[PDB]
Every structure is written in C-alpha cells, then in structure tokens.
Write a structure and sequence with these properties.
part of a larger assembly; 6 chains; alpha+beta; Acetylcholine Binding Protein, Chain: A; Methane Monooxygenase Hydroxylase, Chain G, domain 1; 6-stranded mixed β-sheet; 5-stranded antiparallel β-sheet; 11 strands; binds ligand Z80; Gamma-aminobutyric-acid receptor subunit beta-1 (chain F); transport protein; Ion channel; membrane protein; Gamma-aminobutyric-acid receptor subunit beta-1
Chain lengths: 307, 307, 307, 307, 307, 102
C-alpha cells in the first residue's frame, strides 16, 4: 500500500477573483515513492524530462495521476521530470500554475481575512497513501505587503486525511478511502489603499453633507441637498467601477448607503423644519440646529454597525 | 444494445454570462458498461490513466464518445481513467470544466429564477442506451448563498429520453433514436445586494425628486428639476455599468425609466402650473400642491407594474 | 470528379462583435461521399470516432479538408466521427464552434438588418465537388426573440457556386475552379430594449431642454443651459459605455448630436434674445417665445433625418 | 542555394491594439520551390493535407520553417497542404491568423497615417533565398471604409532584402545573411466618427464656456464657471473611456486641455475683472467685454497648434 | 560538467500588468554546448526544425530543459531548431513569448523606475553549467520613448550565479547547486502623458477650488463648495478608471486626496468664518481673506509630500 | 579597440574586478554610478556615450594547475562595460572636408 511523500513549493499567489471565489497559484509539486530497484546508466540516478516521461509509461512505468481537487480546470503544467533511482525510489517533479477555488467571505471587504488552500489527492488510488506533506513558502510578513496586496498570518497548516466517498462504494466493496493532502495558508487584506483613498473621502463627503444645516435660507438647504445627492451617486459609481464586484454588500458598500441615508433624512428634516410651525412659515427654531446633532446621531448609529 | 450507467458529480457552478446565456460547470463524469471479460494482472481490476487510455483504444478497446449536447465549445478535460474489470465491466471516469448553454429569461431581473442544465448524449450511437442517471450535488439551501450568488430550490431533476433526429434518417433506415440524459438544477438569484444597493437608492432618488414641489418659487422648481434629471442620468449610468448587460429591460431598468418619467412629468406640471392662470402670472393654487399627490400617482402606477 | 453532399445543423448564433464584424456559430457539419467499397466487421457500417480517424488516414483513407472561407481563425472542433459503409460511401460528422466574418453595416443601429453567413469550400480540391447543401435550423420568428436579441426574416438561402481564383492559375493550367457552398441567414435586431431604455430617455431630455424658454429671467435661462449641457454629456457617456463600439455614427449617436445642437442653439437664441433690442436691455418680445417653435423646428429637422 | 517563390493572400486586417502597437491579419501564404523529381500516383501532382504533412517530413521531405519575424506569439495555423509535383517542384500552402507588430505613432490621433507590415524570413536558412514575393489584396479605396475603419492609400510595397545578423557570425564564418520578404500596406484612419461625435461636441462645450462672460453679475459668472469646469471633467471622462488608451497625448487629448485652460483662464479674468477697479467694487468696464476676445485668442492659439 | 553558452535576443517588452506585477517579453533564446562528435550528411552541420527535434531526443539526443524561473505559466514557443555540428557542438535555438514576473513598486507612480528581469536555469541539472550569458537588445534612449511608454536607462546587467536550494538536499547528498543566469534591464516611465493630461488638469481644478474665497456672500461660498466637491469626485472617477489599478496609493492618488482635503477644509473655514463673530452675523474680517493664504498653506504642505 | 572606422568610432570602455586569491569569496552584486548625460556636452567632450550600465559578475575557470587545489578554482569576476561613440565633428569639419576639396 504505497507510501508517497509530497512537497509543494509555492512561488506566487496572485489574481484573486472575488466573484468566482478563485485565486492563482504558481509553484512546483514533488512526489517521491520507492519502487522495484532497476539498473540505471552508470549507477547515477536517471533523469527523464517532459515528453520522454510519457514514453517511459508506455513500458509499464507507473506514475500516479495526482489531482488538484480544488483547481478550476486542468492547470498549466510547465516542465516535468522523473528521477529514477537505482535502489528503486522515484521522484516526480513538475511546475504548475492553476486557478484554485475555495470559499471566500468578502463581506468585511477592505478588512478581509482569507484562507488560500491546495487540496491534492490521487485520482484513482485508495491504498496508495500520502506519506507526509511539506510546503515550502519563502516570504515574510508583516513586511513588503505594503507593495504587496495581502498579509499572511499563519505559515504552514497541513493535514493528510482520508476521504470517504460513500457513493457507489459497492463498485468496490470495503475500500473507497482516498488519501488527501490539504494545504492552507492564511492571509489578511492590506486595508491601507482602500481607507486612505475610499473610506476617508466618503466620510468627508458624508460630513460635509451635514453642513447643509448651516445654510441660512430653506431654498438654499433643500436645493443644496440635491447636489449632495448627486455627489453620492457620483461617488457610488466611482466606488462600484474600481472595487471588486461581489454578490453581497461590502463595508464600503454599507457606508455608501449611509450617505444616501443622511442626505435623504436631511431633506425630510429640512422640509419638516419648514412645515412644523406656529404660523404658516416659521422654520422650527431648535430643529434646524441639529447642526451638531446629525453628526452625533450618525456616529451613534455608526457604532452599532460594528457590533 | 449496450446498457450504460452514468453518474455526474457537480463541483461548482459559476460565472454566468447573461448575454451569451451561458454558465460554467466543473465536475466529474462516470460511465459504466459491461464488456467481454478479459484477463487483468492479478485478478484485481486494471486502471488506465490519461494518455494510456488512447493507446488501449488503438488495440480495439471501444470507448464511446459521450457529447455534451449543450456545451458551448469543447470542454476542458482534466484527468481521465479507465477501470477495466476482469469480469468485463468498464468504468470511464473523467473530470471536466465546460461552458454550457441554456435558455435564460433575465427580465425580472434581481429576482430571477433560472434552470442550469446538462444534456449528455452519445455522439454516434442509437442502440447504445443510457441505463440510469445519478447526479451527486453536495450543497445546502436556503443557506451559505448569502456568501453565494444563487439559491437552489430543487435538487435532482432527471430525464433519459429518446431523441428523434428525423433528418436523413434514411442514412440508416429504422434506427435514429439517440439516448439523451437531461440533468436540470433549479436556482434563484439572491435579491439582497441589488435591493440593498440599487433598488433602494433609486427609490430615494425618485422620492426626493418629488420634493421639488416644496420649493417656494417657480424658477426654483423648474431649475432644480434639471438637477434631478442629471441625478437620474448619473444613476442610470451607475446602474448600467455594474449590472449585467442584456437585450431586454430589467426591473431596475424600468424603475430607471420611472425616474426619467416622474421628473419629466414634474417639469410639465411645474410649467403648466405657472401658465394655467386667471392673471398673467399666478401659479395654480391647488396644483403645485400635488406634493402628496405625485407620490400617490407614482405608487399607484407602481402597483400595476407588478400585475 | 468526386460528388460530396453536405448538411449543416446550426445550434446557436451568438456574440456578435460589432467592431470586428464577427459572430459566433455553434453547430455540426456532415459530409457524405461514396468511395471504393470495403469490408466492415459484420456487414453493419463501421464507426470511427475522433483520434481513431487520423489513424485511418495514415492507411490511405482520403478525407478532404473542408475550409470555412469566412471563419476568423481555425475553429474549435469538438467531436468527429467517420461512418464507413460497406458499399463504399463515407460520412464525416463533426461539431464545430467558430467565429465567422461577414460584411455588416451597423449605421442604422437599433434597427439593424444583418445577414449571418457561412462559406464552406474544400481546401485543396477543384474536381471534388459539393453535390448539394442542406441547412437545418430549428427556431421560430417572430417569437421568443423578445428573450432573444435578433429577428430572423428569411430561412434558407443556399448557393453552391464556383470560385475563379485567377492568380497563378498556370501553377495548374485549365483547372482552378473551387466549389463553394454559401449559406446565409437574414436577421433583424430587436429594437425594443434600445427604444424603451435609450431613445426615449434621450427624447425626454431633449424635450425638457426646450422648457428652458419658459424661465422668466435671462440669467435663469443662460445658466440653466449649462446644466442642460452637462446632462447631455452625462447621457452621451452613459450611451457610449453600454452601446457597441463602432467606427461610424449610429442613429442614437446622431440624436446625441441633435441634443448637443438644440442646446447650443438655445444658448445663442437666449443670448441673442437679450441683445436684439430697442433699449439697452429688452429681451426681444416674440423671440423668447420660440417656446413652441423650437420643438417644431427640431421636429421638422427630425423629419428630414429620415429621408 | 534554393530559390523560393512566395505569395501572400490577405483576407482581413482587423483589431488594432494602440497600446501594444499591434494588429491582426488573416490570410493565406504560399511558398514554391523546385526539388528533386519524384514519382507521384498517376502523373498528377500529389496532395498532402494537414497532419499527413508532418509524416512526410519524418521520411526526409524538407519543408523550411518560414518565420513571421514580426508576429507576436506563434500564430493560429488553420489548414495546410503540400503539392508535390512529379517534376520536383513543391508548393506549401497554409492559412494563418496572427497578431503582428509594428511601430505606430498615434499622436495625431483621429487623423492617423499607419503602415501595416508583414516580414517573412526562413528560420534556419541563409542560402535558401526568397525568389520573388507577391501579395494579393482584393479590396478598394476610398469607397466602403465609411463602413470600414481605415483608408488604404498605397497598394503593394514589397522588398526581399538580406539581413546581416553580425552576432556570433563566427558560429558560422562568412555566411549569416538571411533572405527577408517585407510586405507593407499604408492606411489612414477614417476621421468621420471622431469629428462628428467627439471633436465637434467638445468645441461647442468650449464655445458655450465663453458665454460665461455674458452673465450680468460677477457671482453669476464665477459660479457658472465651476459648472463649466464640471462640464469639461465630465467630457474628459467620456472621451477617455471610449477612445483608445495610449502613452501620449492625442489631438483630442490636447483639445481637452484647451477646455480646462479657457475655463480656468475665465475664472482668473472673471475674478481679476472684479478687483481691478477705481473704487472697491467696480467690474473693470472693458475687460468683462472679452466676450468676443476670448474666442479670438483661443482660435489664434488653435492655429499654432497646427504648425 | 557540461558548459553551456547562452544568448538571449530581446525583441519587445510590452503590456505591463501593474496589479499582477507582470510584463510580456518576446524574443529568441540560444543554447550552445559541445557533445560527442557525430557524422552529419556532407560535413555541413545538420539542422533539425520543430517537430523533428522531439524525434531526435527519442534516439538519445540529450537536450536540457531550460526553465524560465520567473515566467508566469509555460511560455508560447514559436519555432525551434537544433544545429548539430560534426565536431560535436550543438546549438538549440528557439523563439519564445512569455509573461514574466518581478517585484515592481508603482508608488511613485507617473515617475516610475522599474527593472524588467529574466531568470533562466536548467530544470534538472546542477553540473550542467551556464558558461557565459549574452543579451542582445537593439534600441535607443532617451529617444523614441516619447512614442514608447518606457525609458531604458541601463543596457545589460548579467549574473550567472549558483543557487542553493537547501530543502531535501539529502535527496542527493553534496550536490544541489543550480546554475542561474539572471538578466535585468532598468527602465523609467515616460511621465509626459500623465503630467500633461492628469497632473495638470487636477491642479487647475484644485487652484480654481481656492477661488471660492473671492465669492462675495456666504451662501455663495458654502453652496459653490459642494459643486467643487462634485468636481473632485468626478475627477477621481476619471482618474481611477483610466490609470493602472494598484493596491497602494500612487502620487496622482495622493494629489486626489489633497483636493478632497482643501475643499473640506474650505467648508470648515467658510462656516467657521460665519460664526466666529462679534455680533450674531459678521463674517470674520481677516479670515475670509485667506485668499492668498490657502494657496501658500497648500504649497507648503505640498513641499513636505516630496521629502 | 578597433579604430579602422576612425573619425566615426564606436568603443567600449571596460573594468574587470576580481579577487586576487579567493574563489569562495564571491561578488554579491555590482553597482556602477555614472553621472553624465548624452547626446549633450560631448561637443566639448571627445566621446558620445550610448549605453549606461552593463554589468556581469561571472565565474572564471582558470583550468591551468587546478590540481594545485582540486575541485575549486572558479573566481568571481565583476565585469563593467560602458559604450561610447567618437565625436566625428572636428575630424570632418577640419580633416575630411579639406581633403575632399583638395
Ligand atoms: C508580502 N508577502 C506576503 C508577499 C507574498 C504574497 N502572496 C499572496 C498573494 C495573494 C494572496 C495570498 C498570498 S499569500 C502567499 C503565500 C506564499 C507565497 Cl510564496 C506568496 C504569497
Ligand atoms: C448556494 N449554495 C448552494 C452553494 C452552491 C453554489 N453553486 C451555484 C452557483 C450559481 C448557480 C447555481 C449554483 S448551484 C450549485 C450546485 C452544486 C455546487 Cl457544488 C455548487 C453550486
Ligand atoms: C430569435 N430566434 C430566431 C432565436 C435564434 C437566434 N439566433 C441569432 C443570434 C444572433 C444573431 C443572429 C441569429 S439568427 C439564428 C439563426 C439560427 C439559429 Cl439556430 C439561431 C439564431
Ligand atoms: C474597404 N477597405 C477599407 C478595406 C480595407 C480594410 N482593411 C484594414 C483594416 C485595418 C487596418 C488596415 C487595413 S488595410 C487592409 C488591407 C487588405 C485587406 Cl483585404 C483589408 C484591409
Ligand atoms: C525607446 N525604446 C527604448 C523603447 C523601449 C520599450 N520597451 C519596454 C517596455 C516596457 C518596459 C521595458 C521596456 S524596455 C525594452 C527593451 C527592449 C526592447 Cl526591444 C523594447 C523595450
Ligand atoms: C558628455 N559626457 C559623456 C562626457 C563624459 C566623457 N567621459 C569619457 C571620455 C572618454 C571615453 C568615454 C567617456 S564616458 C564617461 C563616463 C563617465 C564620466 Cl564621469 C565621464 C566620461
């Protein structure tokens, strides 16, 4: 029941696809397993590069297909080599680049925590078993990820479990448990760019929105309101175009509704101030001095969005 | 007249293409059919992985090409294995990723009901017949589909019918019936994001549009109208850019016309109020108090949009 | 001089590319031609699927390369079969998906008439001749094409002509005429979406533009003009982004200039009204009552845009 | 030292890529060269289609790899045939589609002159020499290209020169000159669409910008300026999105700065008028009558942009 | 321990991908290494083109797989030839096009300095050693890079170092040092386009923003502020859409915050001016004459952004 | 230096640095800082530099008496090379031309 050692060198993780819940991983994979001894030229181990490998299989060299369970579509394989040893053992080494899938919650958008994962498992073998898994990452955190998009937190999580597959296990009674290496790296999004260039401007806009109450007239207030309205619609548009498209509301996306809100509540106040009067036309004395009472009310409701 | 058992494990449905009426499906397919017994090494069944399979065909192993009738372009095949059994039976197992086509009505829009479908049928065989179909989906609904885009309603819809193809059935008299497995999954779009972030803002915009009648002057009313106009055009653009492009009007798209409408109706009243007079310049007394009569008229016309 | 029968099943025409003058067509092609009789296993005709076909060619089976004259780049071929008959005749059957080219005039944009076309012709044969062509389309019109983008008018246009190719016909004296099947389907664009959601809003905008003459002041008129100016630029942008990019002016694109026009003519009038006077400042009495004379002049010029 | 005749049929030139300086060309290529006579079936020349060609090379048929020096990435080869003649001569014929590169100056912009080019040269042969080159285009100019994007001026430029490659010419002393066919067709951009739909609207906007001086007040003038400012920013955005992205300023791009300029110059004037006075607040009498002096100054500076 | 000479002809570097930190490089690679002498037809060296090469390996011709360490996905190989010499030496010559990865700091932005890099290294050989590396670039700078996006500063830079790979070096004791050629070209971004068309317009906008202090009223000042606000949001959108997307703030991106800043500070002053008074309503005399004190304060803070 | 195209030269000025007695002491990275400008003042100056920065840092074999120390005789050599063009003004304006007239 073959023991297989596996090593995964991860070279680059890039191009998240928020909508498809998808990321790209470039790296090498290495499998090692000891077979029946053989005679090699010299006694040096033998090297078999690319095209030559498939020919060695036509002569009964077994090389197991190891599938990336969580890759979306067959990956781009660059180079592959076999290392056939005189004492039997065999090393398969190949570089890969593949788009891998995992569940990704982006609802806390500019402040994400994500988990990029590789799942390896033999394509047709249940008593060929993954001996031990080793993942070699060569980076550093917190560091260059001001230039880079993501903050890795954890280093190395491995598993190597057994998968059941209870469906048509009568196709082969008593044996349908496959050996699955699971590799998972934890990462955090770099919330600098999105605050310094999206969160902050929106707040200033929402703040300056409240300055509508320091307009003297009423016509001034209500008319100006509509310009604020436009300002948000403009800023929502700017937001939507550049930010990653999703099927839920992000934190930024919530703040954008808060804008739409404060402004439309202003209009109501601005108008109800006018027509809650003692005569026909007296703006209600205290009410349009919600000048430093809208900011408080907004900030109070902006402390329950957090919890 | 060969019996073929089929099983389809569905791994992920993603990337709808509203314009092309198209979706992507990643999963495995398994075919089982009993052939002339053979000697396998040992008596254990024989495994034939990838490249090796095509070689077994060159020696007279028959393996039927099973076509995805409704796939748009030949799909990406990842790994394939044969399981040759000593008692004859044979298992073809392969992972696929393909862009599939089906009719899709998106007119409702953010409140969709769609039907993702697979159609399998042998490419050149009419008395080789699909024994039974089993589809294995491993998800859950109503559930994680706040993080996910779609709400599946049904689980398992199957078909296994006979297709006629009456065109040049004299090419082979009396026999042109192909066995077609049809698999169809029902799903609902998640109408959260689009309400919370598109429907609602537009309503507020349309609502605040009506507040034009609470402007005192006429110049104030008529001038402000044009800013409301701009506000809709802005919001139509924002809408159009982010939402899926289609060749018909969505619900949102109608609401956008309702905006364009109310605002232009306002303009007419606002102006007709001014010149429907007893003197040269008297704004008509009751009319510019359609303040809480436009909201009713719009809302009345917005309850016949539903039925 | 070989006779070849051809039939073309058209499964889907999708993804027009206005700039490249290009459309996508998914379907099957079948060629039939009678060769030297042969012995098949049993007496049942022999089936040769995919990879196996190329092997049968290495043994001297002639299978002509049929080229799609007007396909842009070699198409995606999915499955192919040979049907070798004991009495000689041979059937080639294969599914294709390809991006095809044809001349396409889009100057009447939302109200198009187009002609989607396939041109088939053998790649190296002049006395192998296309016997008869049959095209099998299974749709219906006027019908589901509210859900679908296009309205097919004609059904079946076929040709099968002979192409001259007079360049280096001394490479082979007296014989350079190739047999070219021409298939062409006529279709009309569904002008609903573009009217109900683009043409109409623009008209309301242009209409409301004229309401500028019902402003009392001159400062009111001239200033408001600049907001109208903004509105068109906004609406031009919205138009351009969503509509298909082209190298000529569409109908919509002209109407957008008509907007740009009426508004800039207003400014001139609005200003010329102010200074075409008897005293220093008298707005010319009749002129700023081109209130219901710009609409007529615009509508008069909008009845010569048609013829 | 083999003589090779070449003919290039150009079927379609489409999809310019302004940033990459890149275009697509679909067409056929034909190479002819006389070899050692051979026995053909019959005495009719022998036809060898596609896959079969590579098999004939395995038996010592020499077929020179002809490289497209200026193609970006190996091109899409559609169909290929050999024509083996009994008298020796051999004809290679294949259809190609490839993305070709050339230096492209887009600074003029909507009034471009460009030169689309093919450069052919053998990949490993210096005394195999391109006998004569022939290019077959079947179009017409001026004519259609109101429907088409480009105006071809010249017809046929050919070269067939010798390339030096002085780098490691000691790898093979005395012989490193390769025979290079050069084909180049000259074309002009169709400056209708961009004038009628971009150039023109911008001028009207810039013109209407100047009408700011016919506002009576000063507050009217200065405030309106900012709407003009917004108006340009709006139109700059519209321009940028639709027009081809570049790393230099186009003519349109300059015109857009001219807008930004006149409007900001207006602001300066409008304000300097107010505070260049004999009292505290007297708008300078002649200066705010730069009404028909800004138009002249702009048009004067717009006649030195040309030379 | 094989000596390998390498030459790299670089034809074109294009299509930077700011987000993925990625660039495209098309060129040829040449490897030369002297093997056991052989008999060639004639005594002329033998040429082996494309497909024929792979056949020569099946007969024991060793051709080392040389990997591009920093290429993202296996590159597009166009044509390849072997030049087998009678005296043993062998030349591998092939054209490639590949997307290569390198670290790229885009924070400066329109005034970038970048370093485009190739890393070549044998895929399975440590005592096969890269003798010497030669890179052939044929351009000129400062020069056409007004038409071209980038200004190359340096010419060459080579390395040829030894890489350790200390992970599972017990797989082969005492020998795991691979020979890596490193090529790096230095380049500068051409900051003309981004200054002349982005930096400048923004400044004029920000400058004209300050002209808000020369408005007479207070209602005029505060209301106009909101139009300036809109103007920046507009310009941010325009900026964001066209400029390369990044995960950090560019220089332009900072300037956009400076706009958002000055305008919101204006609002505060404009409002604080009104209610820092001796009576109920006296605008503070000196303060609203920060007319030529905001420009200075902004320019003072804009000289600490540099250092 | 090839001077056969004299008044119209292209030359390559080069530095080669390498440790005098060390093979596993290795030149980590090389950086060369030139502070000039071209085409420019080189009407006053004799030469026109074209390229800026060429570096190498290779390993030199020295296969002669490598048994003096078996298995280790590869020295780390920085190579720096600058490309330059001769200023063909003076020699044309004052030599080429007069001779043609003659
Ligand atoms: C600043 N350094 C974190 C840069 C590394 C960025 N990189 C990455 C990118 C996007 C999402 C997640 C990751 S994690 C990761 C794990 C291994 C390796 Cl080799 C690279 C990465
Ligand atoms: C929403 N949760 C049910 C998650 C499922 C998302 N996913 C999906 C996406 C778009 C449209 C339809 C579906 S159904 C489906 C069926 C099987 C699998 Cl494996 C994935 C999916
Ligand atoms: C609207 N119903 C006619 C549905 C068909 C639409 N479809 C189509 C799409 C884009 C452009 C032209 C066409 S025509 C056509 C011809 C044959 C077939 Cl099989 C499909 C199509
Ligand atoms: C009607 N005529 C304008 C046709 C020319 C259009 N087409 C083209 C497109 C973009 C850039 C350059 C060209 S030139 C050209 C040369 C040969 C052929 Cl076959 C087509 C073209
Ligand atoms: C003015 N000419 C130097 C243009 C250089 C543009 N091009 C380039 C593009 C993007 C990043 C780096 C470079 S460098 C380079 C090196 C060789 C060649 Cl062939 C082209 C380039
Ligand atoms: C116009 N500038 C090129 C003047 C430089 C002349 N100078 C020089 C002289 C003879 C041959 C080559 C050079 S290059 C060079 C590189 C660096 C420095 Cl610091 C001086 C020089």
């Amino acid at each position: 029941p073959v023991d297989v050692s596996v090593s995964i060198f991860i070279n680059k993780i890039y191009g998240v696809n928020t909508l498809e819940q998808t990321y790209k991983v470039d790296g090498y994979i290495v499998a090692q397993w000891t077979g029946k001894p053989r005679k090699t030229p010299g006694d040096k181990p033998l090297i078999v590069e690319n095209t030559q490998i498939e020919r060695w299989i036509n002569n009964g060299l077994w090389v197991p297909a190891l599938e990336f369970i969580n890759v979306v579509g067959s990956p781009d394989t660059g180079n592959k080599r076999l290392m056939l040893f005189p004492d039997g053992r065999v090393i398969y080494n190949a570089r890969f680049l593949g788009s891998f899938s995992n569940d990704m919650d982006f609802r806390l958008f500019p402040f994400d925590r994500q988990q990029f994962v590789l799942e390896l498992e033999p394509f047709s073998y249940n008593n060929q078993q993954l001996r031990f898994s080793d993942i070699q990452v060569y980076t550093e955190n917190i560091d260059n990820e001001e230039i880079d998009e993501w903050w890795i937190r954890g280093k190395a999580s491995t598993h190597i479990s057994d998968i059941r597959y209870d469906h048509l296990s009568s196709v082969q009674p008593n044996q349908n448990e496959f050996s699955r290496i699971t590799v998972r790296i934890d990462a955090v999004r770099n919330p600098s760019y999105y605050l310094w260039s999206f969160i902050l401007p929106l707040g200033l806009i929402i703040a300056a929105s409240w300055s509508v109450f320091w307009l003297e007239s009423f016509s001034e207030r209500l008319q100006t309101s509509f310009t604020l309205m436009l300002t948000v619609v403009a800023y929502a548009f700017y937001t939507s175009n550049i930010l990653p498209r999703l099927p839920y509301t992000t934190v930024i996306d919530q703040m954008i509704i808060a804008g739409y809100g404060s402004i439309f509540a202003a209009i109501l106040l601005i108008i109800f101030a006018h027509h809650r009067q003692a005569n026909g036309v007296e703006d209600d004395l205290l009410i349009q001095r919600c000048r430093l009472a809208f900011p408080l009310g907004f900030l109070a409701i902006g402390c329950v969005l957090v919890i």
